[PDB]
Structure formats: C-alpha cells, structure tokens
Amino acid sequence: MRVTVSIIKADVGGFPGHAHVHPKMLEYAAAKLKEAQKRGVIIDYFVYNVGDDISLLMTHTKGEDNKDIHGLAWETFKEVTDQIAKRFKLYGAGQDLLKDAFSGNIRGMGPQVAEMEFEERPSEPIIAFAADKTEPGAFNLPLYKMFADPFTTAGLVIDPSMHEGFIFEVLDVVEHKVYLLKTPEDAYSLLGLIGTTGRYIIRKVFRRADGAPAAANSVERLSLYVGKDDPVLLVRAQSGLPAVGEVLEAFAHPHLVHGWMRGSHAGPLMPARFISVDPERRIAIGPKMTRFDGPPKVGALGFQLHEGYLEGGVDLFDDPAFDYVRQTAAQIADYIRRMGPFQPHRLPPEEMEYTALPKILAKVKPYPADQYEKDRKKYIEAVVK
Amino acid sequence: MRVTVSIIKADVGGFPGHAHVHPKMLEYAAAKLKEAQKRGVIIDYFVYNVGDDISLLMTHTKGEDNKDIHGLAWETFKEVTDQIAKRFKLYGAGQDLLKDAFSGNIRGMGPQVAEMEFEERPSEPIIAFAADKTEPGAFNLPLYKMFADPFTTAGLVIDPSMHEGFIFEVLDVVEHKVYLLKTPEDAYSLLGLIGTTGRYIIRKVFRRADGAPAAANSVERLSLYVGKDDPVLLVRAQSGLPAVGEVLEAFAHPHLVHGWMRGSHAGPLMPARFISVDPERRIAIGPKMTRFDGPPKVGALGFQLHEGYLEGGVDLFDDPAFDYVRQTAAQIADYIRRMGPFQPHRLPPEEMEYTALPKILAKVKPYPADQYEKDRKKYIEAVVK
Amino acid sequence: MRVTVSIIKADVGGFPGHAHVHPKMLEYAAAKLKEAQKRGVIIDYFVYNVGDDISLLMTHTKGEDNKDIHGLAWETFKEVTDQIAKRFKLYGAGQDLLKDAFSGNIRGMGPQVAEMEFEERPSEPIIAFAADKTEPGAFNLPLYKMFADPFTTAGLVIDPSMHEGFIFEVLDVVEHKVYLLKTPEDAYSLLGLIGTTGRYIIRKVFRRADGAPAAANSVERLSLYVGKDDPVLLVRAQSGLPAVGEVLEAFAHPHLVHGWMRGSHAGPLMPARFISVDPERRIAIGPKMTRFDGPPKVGALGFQLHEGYLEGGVDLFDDPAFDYVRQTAAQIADYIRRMGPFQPHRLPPEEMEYTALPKILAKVKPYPADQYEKDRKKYIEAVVK
Amino acid sequence: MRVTVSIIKADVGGFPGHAHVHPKMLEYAAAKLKEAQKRGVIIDYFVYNVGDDISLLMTHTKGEDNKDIHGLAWETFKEVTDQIAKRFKLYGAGQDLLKDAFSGNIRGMGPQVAEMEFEERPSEPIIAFAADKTEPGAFNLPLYKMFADPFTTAGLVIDPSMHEGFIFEVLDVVEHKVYLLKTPEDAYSLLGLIGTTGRYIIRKVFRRADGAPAAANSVERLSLYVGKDDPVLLVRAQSGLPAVGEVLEAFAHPHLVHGWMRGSHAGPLMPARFISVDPERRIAIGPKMTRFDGPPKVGALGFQLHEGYLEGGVDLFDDPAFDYVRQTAAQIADYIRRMGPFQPHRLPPEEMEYTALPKILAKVKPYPADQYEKDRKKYIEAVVK
Amino acid sequence: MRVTVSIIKADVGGFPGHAHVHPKMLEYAAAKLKEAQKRGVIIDYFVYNVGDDISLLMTHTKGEDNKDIHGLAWETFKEVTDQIAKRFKLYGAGQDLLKDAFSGNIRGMGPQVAEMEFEERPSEPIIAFAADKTEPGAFNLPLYKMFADPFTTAGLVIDPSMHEGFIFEVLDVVEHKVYLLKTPEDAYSLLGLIGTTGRYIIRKVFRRADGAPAAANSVERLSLYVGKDDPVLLVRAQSGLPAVGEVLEAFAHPHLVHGWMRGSHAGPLMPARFISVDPERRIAIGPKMTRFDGPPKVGALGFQLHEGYLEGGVDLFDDPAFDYVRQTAAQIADYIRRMGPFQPHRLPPEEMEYTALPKILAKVKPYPADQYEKDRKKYIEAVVK
C-alpha cells in the first residue's frame, strides 16, 4: 500500500524563553492526534520536541500537500497555543502561527513540513530528525554525506545496488529556482551550491536507480521573517538507500551550523539524546537549549512502518559512541564562544536574524575617507578636547 | 497586573554536616507554603535546596520588604528548625535564625532575600539561582557578564533594544554606601569596585531604557557574623533583557569564588544539575557538597509567570554542554586543592571566616626585627640546644 | 546519652564470583535487624554492601566488644549464609565464617568490626566507609591525611579548636604491639610506621584536646588466613573533628592500595557511588567489582544520629567533582594493569595472598651460583640439545 | 625626537607555493636596506617573513605616507622579484606588485603599509605583528580586546592613566567611509561594525587622554583584487598604553579568521614562533604554512627604539604558555577541516576569493520553483531514464 | 674553609617592556664580575636572568651583609643601567636603583639579596632559584614543602638524619617582627602565618640538628614601593638537607602566586627551562614573560662548590617530567585569565600594586545606604531621564 509520512513542526511557545516546551503541550497535541486517528483522518502519529520546537509526525494516505493533514496540524498548533501557551504566557506563545486563517497549505505560514509518499516496502525503516536553533541548511552537510560521501556511506562503494547514486533537489530560497543534480558526476557543482547553506538547501533526495524518494528536508523560499525556521527531516533507510548507521554516521561530526543565539551565530550541531521516549503514549521529550540558547542540537527517532502504523520511536543518538561526539560539540561550543560578537562566530551581516546596524549608522558620524585623510589630526583633537 | 517575586533562603540544618538538607525539610516547607497559598497570603511558590541552603521562592502581590511575606518565611524556617532539624539533631540546626524574635524584616537576621516587584509582561520568564558555599559577590562576575560583557550577551551589540545598557546598584557592605553605575560608559569604574567581591556587591540591576528591574541579588551590609551568607539571585529574561541563554552563558566559565571549606577558601563555581525537580509537588532537590565541603555550586531554575503563578521549575544547567563546564570545575578544584593552606587558595586574612591567628600570636614569640638581626646566632643556638 | 555505633562486616557469598552480593542477602539482613530493633537489642541499623562485602551498621547502648551485638551480627551472617548463600550456591558461600561456634567476640573469626562509644553530641554527624578488594591499611593514607595533613584538613591550621592535633593508635598486626603517636610532633615517626600498610595499621584515632574518639578502622592481628579482610571505617565529623568535607577530601586522590585480584596486586582506590540508597528500607546497594576483580572501591555513607537513631544514609561520593577522581582511578587501573605479573603491580612475595612459588621451586632445578658459573656452557648446551 | 616607524609588506614569491619564502629574498632585502641606511634614507630596519609574506620594518624621520620610504620598499620588492623570485621561478613571483610604475604612494598597489609617527618616549617599546593567510579584519578582535576589553587589558580598570579609553578609526573598505568611535561609551556600536571583519576594519587607534597614536593596522579600501591582502600591525606599548603582556594576551585565544586556503575559508589564528631571529643580521625567518595552506598564523616581534634605532626583534610568542594556545589552534584546525566545502568553514559567497559559481550556474539547468512543483514527477523520471 | 654564597638581583631595564633582558646586560655584568674576581674581591660568579630580572650569583669569603660585595653588585647594576639600559632606552631603565647613593647595604634600596655563609662541606651542592613576576612569598609554599611536608621530602620520614626537622625564620614584613618556628611540632602555627604570603615570608631555614643554614630567601620589610620585588632563593642540598630532587619536587605543583600583570594578579608559578646556559662564559639566559606579562616563572640552576668556585650552572627544570608541570601551568593560566578583573584572579585591594580606586571614588557619587533605600525610585528615574 502507498503511505504518506508527514512531519509538521512549529514553535508555539517556550518554557522558559526558547529553552524547551511545556510537557502539557506535547500531551495536548498527542490527545488531539489520537482523536484524529480515531476518526480515520490519519493512521498513526508521534509527538516530540527538540528544544522549543514541537514536531507532529503523522502517517496517513492522503498524499503530499494535503489540506486536511496540514489543517489538522494547524488546528493542533492553534489549540495548543490557545489552551496551553497563552494560558501559561509561554515565551513566543503562538510564535510560528503567522496568519489568522488557514489557506489550505501550511507551507510559508511559519511551520515547517517534510513529507514523502511512497509504496511501503517489505520492511520500511525511517528516521525522523528535528533540529533546534538552526536553519534548514544545517542538514545540507549530513544529507550530502549520507547520499554522496563514500567516507560516510560505504554502500556507495560496496553495494552494487547504490552504485548509481542519487538525485538532489536543491531549492534556491532567495530567487525561488530549483536545481536537480546527480551524484557522483555532479558532486562538485552540487557542493558549489549547497556549501552556501543559507541560500541553496537540499529539499528532497531521490534514488537514481528508480526515482524512489529517499529524503525530504523542510525548507521554503524566504519571505518578509519566514524560512530560516528550525528544520525537520525524514529519511528512508536500507535496501539500496543508506543503512540506518550510514544515515547516523552523517551526523557523527558535530559541524558548525548557522542559528544559535538570536539566529545570528555559528555553533556546533550536537546530536543529542531524548530525555524520555514513551512509545505507548506516543510522546518523546527532547533536549533543552541552555548556554547561549543552545548549542544547536538534533534529535533522531527511528521507526518501522507497517500498513502505515509507526512502531517506535527509538532514540538513535543513544550510544556511548555518540557521547564522544557530544563532548566534542561541548568543547567546540566553549572555544567558539570566546569570539563574542565577531565573524565567523557571529554570522555575515546579510545572514543574521538580529541587527542594530541601522540604529548604529544613524548615530555614528561617517567621514568620506578622502576628506577624513586630510583632517585626521583635527578630528582626533576634537574627540580628545 | 503587578506581581512580586521573592526568594527567601536559609540554612537551618544540614544532612550530614553542611553537605545537603534532609528531604523532610523541603516537604515540610512546601506543605506550609501550600497552606499560605490556600489562605491567599501568596499566589504560588517553589521550594528547593542547593547544598545545605533551602530557598523558598514565593510569588505574591504584597510588594518588596513585606512583613507578612518575610514573616511567613521566618515562621516556615522556625517550624522546620523545631519540627525537623532539632528532632533529627541536624548539623547547624537553626544556624541562620540569629534572633529569637521576628522584628518585621528578615534582612540582616541571617536569611537571604532577593525580591523584585514589576508589571508582569505578556510573557514573563525568570530564572532563580541559588549558590552554596560562597558569598553574594560570587555573582558579581556573572551579573557583570550578562548585563555588560558583549562577549557573553550578544543582545548588547545586535539588539537595538538593549543598546542603551544597564544600571547597576552596588552596595559597599563595609561602609554601607550605595553606588549607581551605568554601562557601557561606567564599565571600568564599575569593575574597579565589583572586582573586590567581598566588599562591593551588585545588589540590583535595572534596564537603562525604562528603569525596569532586571535582577536582584541577596546581599546585606556586614554585621557582628552576618552578610557572607550563601546567596540567591533572581533574574528576568528576554525582550530587551538578556535572553535565558545569555543569562546562562554568564555561568559557563566556572570562575573562582570565595567560600568553600570554612568560608575561608577560593574554588571554582560549578553550575550543577538538580538531583530531581517535581513541578507538581513544588519541590526540587539540589546537589550535594562533598570534597572539602564543595566545590561551591550554583543551581538554576527557570519559570514562566502567569497572573503570578509559577509554571516550572526547569533545571537550566541540564545539557551536555554544561557537563564540559562541570568537568572543568572538577579539574580546577583538584588542582587548586594541592595548594593546601596558602593564599590565594586560602583567602586573605581579613576575608576568612575561620582563623586561629589570635591563638598563634599568643603562643609564638616575636622578635623585633632589628634586635633579632644582632642576636640571630644566639637565638638559633638556643633552639638547637 | 551515650551511644555505641558498630559496623560489623562479612563476605558470606558473592554474586557472581566476588563481584557483588545478591540483593536478597541485604533484604534478609535488614529484616533480621528490624526484628532485633523491635526486641530492643539495638536502636537502629543500616545494611549495605560494597562489592561482595556486607556491612551491618548498628547503633545501640551495649558498649564496645559486646557479645549480644557481635552475636547478633554472627547469627545474621550465619542465617544469610544458610538461607540465601548456600541455597543459591553463591561463590565463597559462608567465606568469612571461620569457626562453627560463636565464642562471644566476633573479632579474629574473619568478619571485620569498627565500633566507637561516646556521648552523642548536640549534632552527631558520622560517616561509615566500606572498601572491597583491599586491606585495612588502605585507610592509613586517608586517616593520616584527614587528621594530620594540613593540605587536606584546613581546620588543623585555621580552627583554633583542632590545633592541638590527634592521637593515633597503631596496631602492628605481625608482632601484636600497639603504638600511640601524637600529631603534629610525632608525624614523621607515625609515617615511618604506617607507610608499611600491611604491618602497621591505624586502628583508632582520638582527639588530643579531650581524648574524644574520632575514628575506628577494622583491623585485627594476622592469623593462620585472617586479618587482610576488606575493611570498614567509622569517622565522627565536625566541631573540632574534621568537617565532613575534610574527611571526604582525604579520599580525593585515588591512591594505590594492596588487594585487587587474588589479594596479590596494587591498584587505585576508587571512591564510588552507591547504585541505590533506600533510607526507608534501611538498605543501600553498593558498586560492583569487574575488571581484574576491582579496581578496589570505597563507598561513603553519611548519617546524623539522634538518641542513637540513624537518619541517612547519604552517599557522599555522589558529586561531579568525584567523577574526576573516578576517571583518574579508571585510567590508572588501565596503566598499571599493563604490568601484568611484576612488582610493584604484583605485591611483594611476603604480602601476596596467592602464590605458586612452592610448586615452582619444587620443579625448577637450582644451581649454586659458584658451581653454575664454571659450567654455564655445559648447562646451556644441555638445554639446547 | 620624532620618529616614524613603517612596516611595508608584500608577497613577491613563495617557496614552495604559498608556504614560505626563499631565505635569499630576506638576505637581499636586508642588504638593500643596509645600503639605504648607509645613505641616510632610513635610520634602522628589520626584515622578516611569516609564511610567504615579507615585512620590511623601517624607522626614519620622513613622516607617514612618504614617497621616498614607500619607493624604497617598492624598489626593494621589485629587485627581490627580478633578482631572486623570477630567477628561481618562485610561486606567485612578483604577486603583489600590481602596476609597472611607482606613483609615489605604495598603498592600493597590493603591498600593505602600517606606519605611525610620534615623539619617541623615554622608553619606546613597540611590537610588530605579521599574519599570513588572512585579512586585515583578523586583527579586529585582538585590537578591540587589547584597547577595550577589561578581561584582556587590566590597565583599563586598575591603571588610572588608561581609564579614559581609546579612539578607534574604523575604515569601511566597501563604501570608503571612516568612523571614529570612543571606548568605553561606544563599545557596542564599535562592535556592531567591526564584528563584520571583511567590511569594517580597525585602521588606527589613539589614546583618548592626549590623542597619542597607539596602533596602526594595514588596511586599504577594496579594488578590482586589492585589499584582502595579509596584514601587518604596529602597536606601541606601556605607560598608559597596554603593557606588552596585555597586547599579547589579546592573541591568547586563537580565534577564527577569514583566509586560509584560497582566501575562501575560516580557521584559527595560531600565534607562532619564529624559526630564527638574528638581531645582528637584522633578519628573522617566520613559520611555514602547511596543511590546507595554513592554518593562518601571526608572528610578534618586540623592539625598543632609541633615537629611532631598533634594538630587537624579540619573538614574543616564545613561551610554553603559548604552546597551549598553538595546541588549541592545531586541534580546532583539524575539527573545522572535517566540514570540507560548507559554510561557515567555507566563507560566505560575497567573501570568498575563489569561486566557480559562474561556471556552475552556466551548466546546471534552473527550474522556476512554481513550474518545477507541478512537473517534479516528470523531471525526476527524465533523470532516471 | 668558610664560604659565603650571595645572590644579588635587580631589574634595571626590560627588553621589550618587562618581558626579558637585553643579552648585552648579562655580557656587561659577567665582564664586570670577571674583573672583580681577577682583583680577588670574589672567588667566582654566575650571571643570569629570569624574565626582566638579572641575578648576580657570587661566591666570596667576606661574609653576609658585606659592603664591598653589596657595593660590587650596586656598581655593576649602575654601570649596566648607564652603559646599556639608558643607551638603548630599555623599559624601566634603572627601575630598581631607588637611591642615588650606595649607603653600605643594598637591602631596602630595591635590589633583592639572598646569602648564606657556612663551612663548605666535603660535597657542597646548592641550587639558586630566580622567579619573575611574583613576590618573595611565592616561595613560602615550596620552602614549607621541601623542609616540612613528608609528601614532598621523603628524607623527613626515612632519613634518620633529617628526622629532627627544621627551624624557620619568618619575617612579618608589615610590623617588622621575626618568628622562629620549628617543624614538625610548630607546623600548624607556621602555616597559619606563612599562608598569608604577602605578610609573613620565610626568610631563612636552618637545620634543627646543628643549626646549619639550609636556605635563604630574599625578603625585606615593606617601604614607601619596596619589598614585593621579584625574589631569589638559595638552597643547600643533600646529606641531612633535602636531596636536590626533594628541593625540586617542591616546585612540581605550579601553585598560584601573587604578581603577574601589574603586580595585581594571581597565576600559576611555571618551573621553566633556561633558553641557554654557558658555564664557560658564566651566563645563562632565562625565559621570557609573554601573555599578560607572564605567567610567573621560576628558574633553577644547580652548582657544586669547591673552595668557593662554582661548577655549573645546571638547569634543573630540564626534564620531560617537568613538561607536564609546564603544560599544567599553561592550562591553568588560560583558565584563570577568563576571570578578567575579579578577585581572586585580581588580588585583594590591600595587595595590588596598581589601583585606580582613588580616581573612581572621586568621580562616583555615593549614597548613604539608609537614605538611598527611601529614594531608590527617584534615583533610578533620574538616571533613566
């Protein structure tokens, strides 16, 4: 049977600040999706946060870009906002709900969507990722590695079934143009684009052999505001797609990503454990953001699908081998924070979410550099006097 | 609505020694404040310890320096002392209750108070800190960093709303004089004072733009005895005040503070997790003090206020990034302990809580240095013989 | 009131091997002491293991060397042995029960005893230690440091009340002679003795000011067999005796001790956490011994006494500062194990519990060195041929 | 007497690649300046490289922007290029000599100039810095710290003579505008600018008390090509200007700078020792650039001036305390290199010296994102087929 | 024969700043002492610096406090100052020469003296230490350890000849009183004094058995200015005095000392190698001070005396085992520097060499704390307006 797997994610209020969510928000959302499942709107679901972002993972058979599934998520986030976030005056209450009225598609209204529809395989392992305090381009490096780096994914070399490579759908979120690039042959052009992680973002990946969907990352064109929102990512694994371990090895170097405090810094992406995972209640509580509102973290939950039911989730960063990677991230976060307000720890001026540069340039007197050069002595004496 | 948030803290007995508190003390205190809330004396509360210090965090609408709120805390500490501490003969039972009679204000009677009154914001995130085995000046470095160091708080540079800086109310606890200093322009004079952490202590911070209260640290003038008592600190966060993460980044270097064993040493301030946090029972059990009666530790609990109700607490040092900072603190504590009884690990002689210097100078014969110089040979032969 | 605090400890069976105890043994022992308390034989108790050693900590008013208290422990160990250890065929079942008949004093029959009687102070904090896989002399270094090293115990310098020092009762377990040495003046003679940790063992420490008992270590003269048994130690803290933190700082360097595999090696003494502590059930489950049957570990439980009741225990090695000390111990255990069967990792030949040296010397032909020297060529050709 | 100190620096050929210089280039330059000194054009000189950049440090009394001193440097670089670099076909031979004809001022022709004129003090300590594989903005963080960060420069707090702060002359190298900002009061506006290290660069610093020149960094407006060239920096120290140690502490965190391979990456600025320093021959040979053409490194040579003579140079990064800082840099260089071609290790697309983005966008077919969305299925089948 | 060994030390100019000395200063001094030796004023000599301090080590038979030997050192420092330091305008030229006229004793005029006279033993090993950027009390911890800590000096326990202990001559440099304390019995009183390292300084140590001089540290009463000057120390070793290795083990923990930048900070004492040692030329060139004008460093040169001739020096910190101790010091220097201007990294306000506190208190308005409390609202609105 064909099944659609959809993650729709929003931040509708933090607890406190942007550090985490209130657990009643997850409880409320899971009860609301349980009602939808009882009415047959969806097959199954799982609700979890990383940081202050709540992901609703739903399986159903309504296809991609479905108004009832997008509406179901919109209504769930709206009811969490009104019943829980506003009641407790949580910080950024209703943050991502950027219009008053659901139009039919949630995309572009602030919440993030990653969805894929496909024929469910004889075994259908999937991993759902959620990252807080970063941008969709944070996943460009991991997605490149797991589908195209032979130092990550051994199947590309030793699995005759993966030898043909993958097709990357890259969105330029500035000029709203899509590029299709095929690895291995296009690897250098692909990297020329997706190295600029705030502009060219991997949105989908397909298998070259048959066109099978292999991953979907939440990204939308930029709007004024919308589009740097913390991402979610779905990846299908095994049987000609990277193994669960190849997918996870792509996160084993905690690379620098853009986001962290005020959406205006670079820090390491720490692969973090969930605080708790309750497969019966369908809820997992992810990690907090603490120093400097981070560092940015990604959680990974694995599932096996059957007739669209989700058995899981399993926390896939829960291994002492990943504690080495967390320790690396914690040490790099301390090193780079000693740079304070300077690039490249602070982001390039086009890329920062916060700036006071207008206020500064309104108050600080400029001198044409040619004129200034003749009168430097006079200008300095003025300041000294 | 206007709300007052008050932390009133005392050590009324340790378990064992000064290492921790007995959990029935927290249970007793929480039941007593639940009774006060049922009678409308306060709105909400949370009870927790770090080390052997119990903090009562209360919200109410009676304003600062209120005799009913101070009396409520005095009576709670007295009843814990008589019903629990004295019954179990805990160490330092009733330690901080330094008179027999409540006068109307608890300040100066040994317990520590940090309180702020303000109009509750549309979202009102706050963090309550408690440190054991140190002095109020332990928070001078973090408070300076979060309100005035652009390497800690990125908002000072990139948040046009914070660009105007902050006003620090500094108490000279020796001569009982208050200084008001404004950053950025007064940063060097401010530091000239608050670097001497046992004399000039930040007591309050206000926002320069509007005068909004931003933090309150527990400190009182010194008395003979009173005033070096382990501190508590309230900080309001976000929206023109430092983000929760900027506040927490100010604790991410575990700097040396005065206190530790016998109130007479310097060691690193470790940002520690709570052992447990129970938002329903309104109780959190903080960390123990072990080697050398420490090292000194600070706990951080975040809340969101609504109509004065406290949703929380959330332990905000609970992140693998802070395990790097705890490991740093544990290594520095071992290094500096190899210095034993010598300055600067032992404190300056004016600053130590314990001394045997009177007993020594009564028993060891002095020689005027001029006279001694002629007869050194004779004095040495005397000792040898 | 005068109270006696007694720890009586035995290994009556391990689970598996010598790695740990079976939890039903602790359950059985705690129920048996609950019966004794109901009959008024003792006031209170706490039962715990470290490794394969079970400590029964009892408070009572029958004094030191009491036959009913020693008999109570003997009967408890015998009933655990017959009902639990022999039933499950645990390893070393009844190991320490070295006669068939209780004579009146358990000392010298294999179990270890540390006891002190004193007037209960207005606050009476005590710490009970238990070490597995080592000998009573393992505590010589910590006991020396906490009572006589000014780099450990700051009170010796800055606490006029501790300035007069301490009296150490040292047992020569070979020639059965007792030495009384007073610090500071006798420190170098004391160390000349107790540096030889398998022969001269600190058995008791008293305060010099008033003769108050301050510590008691389990040690008995050596017998043939008996006396190297894993020790237990009681220390009273505070108020002119070292602070709880000074006692614990004496364990903050994980020094090399004798014991570990086969009672025949040297390894670092790791200060370990308990797996669980249940003050209601009166039971704590201590750490396992794993690589090479260790490394040797010590647990520390703190209590406050009141009318002889034991409020506690509190695990006093439970602090991230001691995780640095555990990591040091884990690294030193790996380094020293690469030495295999050579001194000083293997113990001196008089000091090892296991030897095959008789079997070797019976099978390997000796040559008088003078004779051998003339005929070396001939003897080598013989072996080669 | 008034003296001018001028550093004029160029890369006229590397050995091999951009890794180092050929030692005969330094020999040639030192002999040429010895001839100039004999003819009285300059007072004294010192010639050194860091990486593939040669600095000519000259003292003289001709003032700033002098055509004979600039011409002397131009002719020296031209003669090194023709006699040495072209003869040995060194890599980038004559790289920085960007016209055929000296116009009168070397600035803007590719070589870098930092110069200051002042009355020589009763003691006149100066430090000359040279960095390879980075841009003038690499010194923005150190210059900010040594003149305005009280965590670097203790004199700002405890030296009543430095309390008044400093005046920073900041050049916008894009729009050719100069800003004058005074610390402490302007610190946050200053940082708002100079955090964008590729656009707003500290060019000079003056003392606020008297207007004394305190530092000069080599920077020129950007041209098409010119202006990101590896910088040189002169700093005067002591007596109301930061101490030599305060200047050096500003380099003790090896922060990330822009440059490294292909002028297109971010890596840590390692404070490196010179390979050799010969005060008699007036030559020092600085460090090589190796992995990934770096990491970027800065050398520091201290001098004392007398009547314009240069006694020195002294390598001021030669201390085991700075080996910790080099080890930190070597570990961060290995961590960040695992990011390969992705921001923020690769620079923002406006900021990179190399790009192939034109070639890519000429070869990779774009799809308008709206059109693509309808036909995704068709486009993927096309690629698969 | 009786011989006197005298170290007389001064800083007469740094190169650059306070980082090092100019090598011609050492050359000049060694030639001047060679002339004195040819004229029979002294027997032998050795000249060396650590940092910006030059030590003249001389052997002779004129006894302690000799005007010709003190005058010889004064004249050597004066001639270095006039011929070398002033000629090159070195920083702090003539710094320690605090009068115009030699009175007969150099002590108290700024230079530091440590001298001992004794019958030369059948073998006479001595070590000369010099520390820069700290105070004479920096040696209190090492001198205590090598003569009184049995964890440093094994001879105190296992050398029947050292069992009787040592006599410490302690100078109170504030009230000008001398204390004589004998270890082991007086260890706790001694530490009560010499833990306050800026007030009670070990000046001499003698052997208890016979009164033999064992060490002499340079310290003088404080004057206004004089007395915190960087110290020098002579220690005799072996044969009932600590072994060379016991002396050196007392420096193997790089403890925190007072001094470093501006004489106003605490940092670790790094045991450093000499850059070069030339026994023929009688010169050694010690280490530089770099970050933050340090960290503070101590050098150790060993000699064997024969008829007063000095065979040596040997650098006794030159061993890979001490590279661990240097790495520890380099890491602690980086940790503690992140504290910036706060105690205990900055010194107590009585103890700092630099302060701007007068200037601050002249400019910052105080409010009596009682009055301020009523009008806080008004004062804050004033600042905000």
Ligand SMILES: O=C(CO)[C@@H](O)[C@H](O)[C@H](O)COP(=O)(O)O
């Ligand atoms: O079982 C193992 C190894 O023994 C796994 O490492 C699989 O080989 C891998 O996950 C690829 O499995 P397929 O996707 O090829 O089935």
Ligand SMILES: O=C(CO)[C@@H](O)[C@H](O)[C@H](O)COP(=O)(O)O
């Ligand atoms: O959401 C993020 C980043 O994406 C946080 O880092 C906030 O930017 C920060 O906490 C300041 O928030 P305000 O106080 O300005 O609302």
Ligand SMILES: O=C(CO)[C@@H](O)[C@H](O)[C@H](O)COP(=O)(O)O
């Ligand atoms: O409270 C503190 C420090 O503030 C403890 O370090 C005690 O000073 C110490 O445990 C000795 O306490 P006494 O035994 O002297 O009562």
Ligand SMILES: O=C(CO)[C@@H](O)[C@H](O)[C@H](O)COP(=O)(O)O
């Ligand atoms: O030779 C060794 C060891 O083999 C040295 O460690 C000496 O034992 C030590 O230096 C004390 O020597 P004395 O001062 O007792 O002669």
Ligand SMILES: O=C(CO)[C@@H](O)[C@H](O)[C@H](O)COP(=O)(O)O
């Ligand atoms: O001598 C020392 C410390 O003893 C140096 O740290 C100087 O204090 C510092 O270099 C500032 O010197 P000035 O610039 O104030 O002269």
Ligand SMILES: [Mg+2]
């Ligand atoms: Mg948020």
Ligand SMILES: [Mg+2]
């Ligand atoms: Mg988020």
Ligand SMILES: [Mg+2]
């Ligand atoms: Mg207490």
Ligand SMILES: [Mg+2]
């Ligand atoms: Mg306390």
Ligand SMILES: [Mg+2]
């Ligand atoms: Mg056993």
Ligand SMILES: [Mg+2]
């Ligand atoms: Mg055992």
Ligand SMILES: [Mg+2]
């Ligand atoms: Mg080049």
Ligand SMILES: [Mg+2]
């Ligand atoms: Mg270059």
Ligand SMILES: [Mg+2]
């Ligand atoms: Mg000097």
Ligand SMILES: [Mg+2]
């Ligand atoms: Mg000096």
